[PDB]
Protein backbone atom coordinates (compact mmCIF):
# COMPACT_ATOMS: atom_id res chain seq x y z
CA UNK A 1 0.00 0.00 0.00
CA UNK A 2 2.98 2.36 0.54
CA UNK A 3 5.62 1.77 -2.12
CA UNK A 4 9.32 2.05 -1.40
CA UNK A 5 11.85 2.71 -4.05
CA UNK A 6 15.38 2.16 -3.12
CA UNK A 7 18.30 2.97 -5.34
CA UNK A 8 20.78 1.69 -6.18
CA UNK A 9 20.24 -1.98 -6.43
CA UNK A 10 23.99 -2.69 -6.33
CA UNK A 11 27.05 -0.52 -5.43
CA UNK A 12 30.82 -1.08 -5.59
CA UNK A 13 33.24 1.24 -3.78
CA UNK A 14 36.74 1.21 -2.36
CA UNK A 15 37.78 1.24 1.27
CA UNK A 16 37.38 4.77 2.62
CA UNK A 17 34.86 5.92 0.00
CA UNK A 18 31.48 7.58 0.54
CA UNK A 19 28.38 5.54 -0.36
CA UNK A 20 24.91 7.03 -0.54
CA UNK A 21 21.62 5.33 -0.77
CA UNK A 22 18.21 6.94 -1.20
CA UNK A 23 14.76 5.75 -0.46
CA UNK A 24 11.49 7.04 -1.99
CA UNK A 25 8.02 6.68 -0.39
CA UNK A 26 4.67 6.85 -2.21
CA UNK A 27 3.09 8.98 0.52
CA UNK A 28 4.63 10.92 3.37
CA UNK A 29 5.72 8.77 6.29
CA UNK A 30 7.02 11.72 8.39
CA UNK A 31 10.10 10.33 10.22
CA UNK A 32 8.82 6.74 10.47
CA UNK A 33 11.76 5.14 8.70
CA UNK A 34 14.40 2.67 9.83
CA UNK A 35 17.54 1.34 8.16
CA UNK A 36 18.83 -2.22 8.56
CA UNK A 37 22.01 -4.00 7.51
CA UNK A 38 21.84 -7.69 6.57
CA UNK A 39 25.21 -9.37 6.39
CA UNK A 40 24.69 -12.55 4.34
CA UNK A 41 23.63 -15.58 6.34
CA UNK A 42 23.10 -13.55 9.51
CA UNK A 43 20.11 -11.69 10.93
CA UNK A 44 19.32 -8.08 10.15
CA UNK A 45 20.74 -5.38 12.34
CA UNK A 46 19.14 -2.07 13.13
CA UNK A 47 21.27 0.83 11.94
CA UNK A 48 19.07 3.92 12.03
CA UNK A 49 15.60 4.68 13.38
CA UNK A 50 13.38 7.80 13.35
CA UNK A 51 14.95 8.63 9.94
CA UNK A 52 18.15 10.15 11.37
CA UNK A 53 18.64 8.64 14.85
CA UNK A 54 21.71 6.40 15.11
CA UNK A 55 21.09 3.30 17.24
CA UNK A 56 23.54 2.70 20.07
CA UNK A 57 26.48 0.48 19.14
CA UNK A 58 26.62 1.55 15.46
CA UNK A 59 29.75 3.32 14.13
CA UNK A 60 29.34 7.08 13.78
CA UNK A 61 30.17 6.84 10.05
CA UNK A 62 26.61 5.72 9.25
CA UNK A 63 24.10 8.54 8.97
CA UNK A 64 20.50 8.77 7.82
CA UNK A 65 18.82 12.02 6.83
CA UNK A 66 15.54 13.03 5.25
CA UNK A 67 11.86 13.05 5.97
CA UNK A 68 8.45 12.64 4.44
CA UNK A 69 8.89 10.90 1.09
CA UNK A 70 12.69 11.20 0.59
CA UNK A 71 15.35 9.54 2.78
CA UNK A 72 19.03 8.72 2.59
CA UNK A 73 21.67 6.60 4.30
CA UNK A 74 25.27 7.69 3.88
CA UNK A 75 28.30 5.57 4.77
CA UNK A 76 31.28 7.92 4.83
CA UNK A 77 34.38 5.73 5.17
CA UNK A 78 33.53 2.34 3.66
CA UNK A 79 35.04 -0.56 5.51
CA UNK A 80 35.41 -4.18 4.33
CA UNK A 81 33.15 -5.22 7.20
CA UNK A 82 30.42 -2.88 5.87
CA UNK A 83 29.54 -5.37 3.09
CA UNK A 84 25.87 -6.37 3.26
CA UNK A 85 22.46 -5.61 1.81
CA UNK A 86 20.82 -2.46 3.19
CA UNK A 87 17.08 -1.94 3.61
CA UNK A 88 14.79 0.96 4.44
CA UNK A 89 11.57 0.23 6.33
CA UNK A 90 8.45 2.38 6.53
CA UNK A 91 6.61 2.43 9.84
CA UNK A 92 3.81 4.89 9.09
CA UNK A 93 0.95 2.57 8.21
CA UNK A 94 0.18 -1.12 7.91
CA UNK A 95 1.43 -3.12 5.94
CA UNK A 96 4.96 -2.56 7.12
CA UNK A 97 6.83 -2.23 3.88
CA UNK A 98 10.49 -2.46 2.95
CA UNK A 99 12.71 -1.25 0.17
CA UNK A 100 14.06 -3.60 -2.45
CA UNK A 101 17.48 -3.43 -0.89
CA UNK A 102 20.88 -2.25 -1.97
CA UNK A 103 23.90 -4.53 -2.07
CA UNK A 104 27.24 -2.93 -1.07
CA UNK A 105 30.52 -4.50 -2.23
CA UNK A 106 34.18 -3.50 -2.07
CA UNK A 107 36.58 -2.84 -4.94
CA UNK A 108 40.02 -4.14 -4.07
CA UNK A 109 43.42 -4.94 -5.56
CA UNK A 110 43.24 -7.91 -7.93
CA UNK A 111 44.17 -11.12 -6.15
CA UNK A 112 44.99 -14.51 -7.72
CA UNK A 113 43.49 -17.60 -6.09
CA UNK A 114 45.17 -20.51 -4.40
CA UNK A 115 44.13 -23.79 -6.01
CA UNK A 116 43.70 -26.93 -3.87
CA UNK A 117 42.43 -30.35 -5.01
CA UNK A 118 40.81 -33.00 -2.78
CA UNK A 119 40.55 -36.66 -3.93
CA UNK A 120 37.68 -38.85 -2.65
CA UNK A 121 38.03 -40.19 0.87
CA UNK A 122 37.93 -43.97 1.12
CA UNK A 123 34.82 -43.44 3.27
CA UNK A 124 32.88 -41.99 0.35
CA UNK A 125 34.44 -44.72 -1.83
CA UNK A 126 33.09 -47.67 0.19
CA UNK A 127 29.61 -46.21 -0.31
CA UNK A 128 30.10 -46.49 -4.09
CA UNK A 129 30.39 -42.80 -5.05
CA UNK A 130 33.40 -40.66 -5.91
CA UNK A 131 33.55 -36.88 -5.50
CA UNK A 132 36.64 -34.80 -6.31
CA UNK A 133 36.65 -31.26 -4.98
CA UNK A 134 38.56 -28.27 -6.35
CA UNK A 135 38.96 -25.16 -4.19
CA UNK A 136 39.81 -21.61 -5.30
CA UNK A 137 40.80 -19.47 -2.35
CA UNK A 138 40.86 -15.69 -1.68
CA UNK A 139 40.62 -14.16 -5.16
CA UNK A 140 39.28 -10.87 -6.64
CA UNK A 141 37.39 -10.04 -8.81
CA UNK A 142 34.58 -12.63 -8.61
CA UNK A 143 34.70 -14.00 -12.15
CA UNK A 144 36.71 -17.22 -12.46
CA UNK A 145 36.68 -20.35 -14.55
CA UNK A 146 37.14 -23.98 -13.46
CA UNK A 147 37.50 -26.78 -16.02
CA UNK A 148 37.56 -30.42 -14.95
CA UNK A 149 39.59 -32.82 -17.09
CA UNK A 150 39.57 -36.58 -16.62
CA UNK A 151 42.36 -38.19 -18.64
CA UNK A 152 42.50 -34.87 -20.54
CA UNK A 153 38.84 -35.29 -21.50
CA UNK A 154 37.00 -32.10 -20.57
CA UNK A 155 33.83 -32.61 -18.60
CA UNK A 156 30.31 -31.26 -18.47
CA UNK A 157 27.19 -32.52 -16.76
CA UNK A 158 28.91 -34.09 -13.74
CA UNK A 159 30.05 -30.94 -11.93
CA UNK A 160 28.64 -28.16 -9.78
CA UNK A 161 30.28 -24.94 -8.54
CA UNK A 162 29.58 -22.71 -5.55
CA UNK A 163 30.83 -19.26 -4.57
CA UNK A 164 30.89 -17.28 -1.35
CA UNK A 165 30.02 -13.73 -0.46
CA UNK A 166 32.86 -11.27 -0.05
CA UNK A 167 34.96 -11.59 3.06
CA UNK A 168 34.49 -9.10 5.86
CA UNK A 169 38.27 -8.92 6.40
CA UNK A 170 40.04 -9.02 3.01
CA UNK A 171 37.11 -8.56 0.59
CA UNK A 172 38.05 -11.66 -1.44
CA UNK A 173 36.20 -14.63 -2.79
CA UNK A 174 36.28 -18.38 -2.59
CA UNK A 175 34.88 -21.09 -4.84
CA UNK A 176 34.45 -24.83 -4.58
CA UNK A 177 33.68 -27.02 -7.58
CA UNK A 178 32.64 -30.62 -7.15
CA UNK A 179 32.92 -33.44 -9.68
CA UNK A 180 30.68 -36.41 -8.85
CA UNK A 181 31.39 -39.77 -10.51
CA UNK A 182 30.42 -43.32 -9.62
CA UNK A 183 32.91 -45.72 -8.10
CA UNK A 184 32.86 -47.41 -11.50
CA UNK A 185 33.39 -44.41 -13.74
CA UNK A 186 35.94 -43.05 -11.27
CA UNK A 187 37.98 -46.25 -11.07
CA UNK A 188 38.07 -46.50 -14.89
CA UNK A 189 40.27 -43.38 -15.33
CA UNK A 190 43.74 -42.43 -14.08
CA UNK A 191 44.46 -38.67 -14.00
CA UNK A 192 42.03 -36.15 -12.48
CA UNK A 193 42.85 -32.48 -13.04
CA UNK A 194 41.41 -29.03 -12.40
CA UNK A 195 42.27 -26.04 -14.66
CA UNK A 196 41.65 -22.62 -13.10
CA UNK A 197 41.49 -19.45 -15.17
CA UNK A 198 41.60 -16.05 -13.45
CA UNK A 199 42.74 -12.59 -14.45
CA UNK A 200 45.36 -12.56 -11.65
CA UNK A 201 47.15 -15.43 -13.40
CA UNK A 202 48.97 -14.76 -16.65
CA UNK A 203 48.69 -18.52 -17.24
CA UNK A 204 45.90 -20.96 -16.38
CA UNK A 205 46.93 -23.18 -13.47
CA UNK A 206 46.25 -26.93 -13.37
CA UNK A 207 46.19 -29.12 -10.24
CA UNK A 208 46.13 -32.85 -10.97
CA UNK A 209 46.50 -36.11 -9.15
CA UNK A 210 46.42 -39.79 -9.99
CA UNK A 211 43.75 -42.11 -8.69
CA UNK A 212 44.70 -44.11 -5.63
CA UNK A 213 47.56 -41.83 -4.56
Cα–Cα distances in angstroms (integers) from residue 74 to residues 20, 61, 113, in the given order: 4, 8, 33
Among candidate residues 88, 87, 68, 73, the one with its CA nearest the CA of residue 26: 68
Cα–Cα distances in angstroms (integers) from residue 198 to residues 191, 204, 209, in the given order: 23, 7, 21
Among candidate residues 55, 54, 60, 56, the one with its CA nearest the CA of residue 76: 60
Q: Which is nearer to other proteins, 19 or 192 (CB)?
A: 192
- Minimal distance in Å, beta carbon 99 to other proteins? 7
Q: Which is nearer to other proteins, 55 or 195 (CB)?
A: 55
- Minimal distance in Å, beta carbon 137 to other proteins? 6
Handedness of CA 81, 86, 92, 96 (dihedral sign): negative
Q: Which is nearer to other proteins, 94 or 184 (CB)?
A: 94
Q: Which is nearer to other proteins, 11 or 76 (CB)?
A: 11
Name the residues that contact other proteins, by CB under 8 A.
Answer: 32-34, 36, 42-46, 49, 55, 87, 89-101, 114, 116-121, 123-124, 127, 131, 133, 135, 137, 160-164, 174-176, 178, 180, 207, 209, 213
- Minimal distance in Å, beta carbon 164 to other proteins? 6
- Minimal distance in Å, beta carbon 34 to other proteins? 4
Q: Which is nearer to other proteins, 76 or 158 (CB)?
A: 158
- Minimal distance in Å, beta carbon 114 to other proteins? 5
Q: Which is nearer to other proteins, 18 or 40 (CB)?
A: 40
Q: Are 85 and 103 in contact (CB under 8 A)?
A: yes
**Beta-carbon count within 10 A of 198 CB:** 22
At 183, give phi and psi (nearest 5°): -60, -25
- Minimal distance in Å, beta carbon 18 to other proteins? 24
Q: How many alpha carbons fall within 13 Å on the CB side of residue 2?
A: 23
d(CA 7, CA 20): 9
Amino acid sequence: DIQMTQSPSSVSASVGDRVIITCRASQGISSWLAWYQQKPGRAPRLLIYDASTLESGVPSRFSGRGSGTEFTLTINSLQPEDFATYYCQQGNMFPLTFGGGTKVEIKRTVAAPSVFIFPPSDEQLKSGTASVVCLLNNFYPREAKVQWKVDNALQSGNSQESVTEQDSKDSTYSLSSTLTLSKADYEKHKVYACEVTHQGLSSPVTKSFNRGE
